[PDB]
Scaffold this motif. Structure first.
Motif, PDB file in Angstrom:
ATOM      1  N   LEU A  64       0.821  -1.212   0.000  1.00 53.87           N
ATOM      2  CA  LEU A  64       0.000   0.000   0.000  1.00 53.87           C
ATOM      3  C   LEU A  64       0.858   1.265   0.000  1.00 53.87           C
ATOM      4  O   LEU A  64       0.543   2.239  -0.692  1.00 53.87           O
ATOM      5  CB  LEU A  64      -0.922   0.018   1.225  1.00 53.87           C
ATOM      6  N   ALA A  65       1.939   1.250   0.774  1.00 53.60           N
ATOM      7  CA  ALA A  65       2.828   2.411   0.865  1.00 53.60           C
ATOM      8  C   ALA A  65       3.554   2.736  -0.438  1.00 53.60           C
ATOM      9  O   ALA A  65       3.988   3.875  -0.635  1.00 53.60           O
ATOM     10  CB  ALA A  65       3.846   2.210   1.992  1.00 53.60           C
ATOM     11  N   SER A  66       3.694   1.748  -1.320  1.00 56.03           N
ATOM     12  CA  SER A  66       4.362   1.973  -2.602  1.00 56.03           C
ATOM     13  C   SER A  66       3.476   2.699  -3.626  1.00 56.03           C
ATOM     14  O   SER A  66       3.990   3.387  -4.510  1.00 56.03           O
ATOM     15  CB  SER A  66       4.851   0.648  -3.201  1.00 56.03           C
ATOM     16  N   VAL A  67       2.157   2.559  -3.518  1.00 59.53           N
ATOM     17  CA  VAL A  67       1.273   3.229  -4.472  1.00 59.53           C
ATOM     18  C   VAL A  67       0.569   4.478  -3.921  1.00 59.53           C
ATOM     19  O   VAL A  67       0.225   5.388  -4.676  1.00 59.53           O
ATOM     20  CB  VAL A  67       0.196   2.253  -5.047  1.00 59.53           C
ATOM     21  N   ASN A  68       0.370   4.528  -2.612  1.00 61.08           N
ATOM     22  CA  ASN A  68      -0.305   5.667  -1.982  1.00 61.08           C
ATOM     23  C   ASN A  68       0.259   7.039  -2.411  1.00 61.08           C
ATOM     24  O   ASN A  68      -0.498   7.957  -2.750  1.00 61.08           O
ATOM     25  CB  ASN A  68      -0.228   5.518  -0.461  1.00 61.08           C
ATOM     26  N   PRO A  69       1.595   7.199  -2.397  1.00 64.02           N
ATOM     27  CA  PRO A  69       2.189   8.482  -2.799  1.00 64.02           C
ATOM     28  C   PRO A  69       1.887   8.869  -4.252  1.00 64.02           C
ATOM     29  O   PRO A  69       1.867  10.052  -4.600  1.00 64.02           O
ATOM     30  CB  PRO A  69       3.686   8.256  -2.585  1.00 64.02           C
ATOM     31  N   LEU A  70       1.655   7.869  -5.097  1.00 61.86           N
ATOM     32  CA  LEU A  70       1.386   8.123  -6.508  1.00 61.86           C
ATOM     33  C   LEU A  70       0.036   8.800  -6.768  1.00 61.86           C
ATOM     34  O   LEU A  70      -0.199   9.302  -7.861  1.00 61.86           O
ATOM     35  CB  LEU A  70       1.507   6.812  -7.304  1.00 61.86           C
ATOM     36  N   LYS A  71      -0.844   8.828  -5.768  1.00 62.77           N
ATOM     37  CA  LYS A  71      -2.140   9.493  -5.936  1.00 62.77           C
ATOM     38  C   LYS A  71      -1.919  10.988  -6.155  1.00 62.77           C
ATOM     39  O   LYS A  71      -2.631  11.624  -6.926  1.00 62.77           O
ATOM     40  CB  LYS A  71      -3.027   9.321  -4.697  1.00 62.77           C
ATOM     41  N   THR A  72      -0.925  11.542  -5.465  1.00 64.08           N
ATOM     42  CA  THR A  72      -0.617  12.963  -5.580  1.00 64.08           C
ATOM     43  C   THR A  72      -0.101  13.300  -6.973  1.00 64.08           C
ATOM     44  O   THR A  72      -0.419  14.361  -7.521  1.00 64.08           O
ATOM     45  CB  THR A  72       0.428  13.394  -4.524  1.00 64.08           C
ATOM     46  N   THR A  73       0.684  12.390  -7.553  1.00 65.77           N
ATOM     47  CA  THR A  73       1.226  12.602  -8.891  1.00 65.77           C
ATOM     48  C   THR A  73       0.078  12.631  -9.899  1.00 65.77           C
ATOM     49  O   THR A  73       0.087  13.429 -10.837  1.00 65.77           O
ATOM     50  CB  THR A  73       2.234  11.489  -9.266  1.00 65.77           C
TER      51      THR A  73
END
Length: 144
Positions: free
Chosen positions: A37-46
């Motif tokens: 989950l931590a690997s994709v969560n930040p990509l929401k902002t991108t």
């Protein structure tokens, strides 16, 4: 040194292990879920930033393309050896639902092959997390 004293020793160790080993495995399983989950969560902002400026998002580690107006995610599909990251549709411009997924192809027996999905509904721009892992290993904030 007697056989009785030996049997008790083996009995004690075997019990402490029979209890601890399953707990360790459970702990590893919960940790794998959190890492995926931590690997994709930040990509929401991108994704949100590209859309908010009228641009699209593409997978991979390429460069920003002013001609096609595409922004890259900036991470290789296999950067986290626990599994693989994927974007759909690819590229995505916000006129349709979007998903960012992490497939745990390199996980232990409990999570091997399970998938965590972050879904953005195009109509209201809301994000929702779902998982197909065993309920006990699902991250807080995610559901089936």
């Amino acid at each position: 040194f007697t056989l009785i004293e030996l049997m008790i020793v083996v009995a004690i160790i075997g019990i402490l292990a029979a209890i601890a080993i399953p707990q360790y495995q459970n702990y590893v399983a919960r940790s794998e879920g959190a890492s995926a989950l931590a690997s994709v969560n930040p990509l929401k902002t991108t994704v949100e930033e590209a859309l908010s400026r009228g641009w699209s998002v593409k997978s991979g580690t390429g460069t920003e393309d002013a001609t096609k107006k595409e922004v890259p995610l900036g991470v290789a599909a296999d950067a986290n050896k626990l599994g693989t990251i994927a974007l759909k549709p690819d590229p995505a411009d916000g006129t349709a639902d979007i998903t960012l997924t992490f497939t745990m192809g390199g996980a232990g027996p409990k999570n091997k092959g399970k998938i965590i999905t972050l879904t953005r509904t195009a109509a209201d721009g809301l994000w929702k997390c779902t998982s197909d892992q065993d309920e006990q290993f699902i991250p807080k904030g995610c559901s089936r």
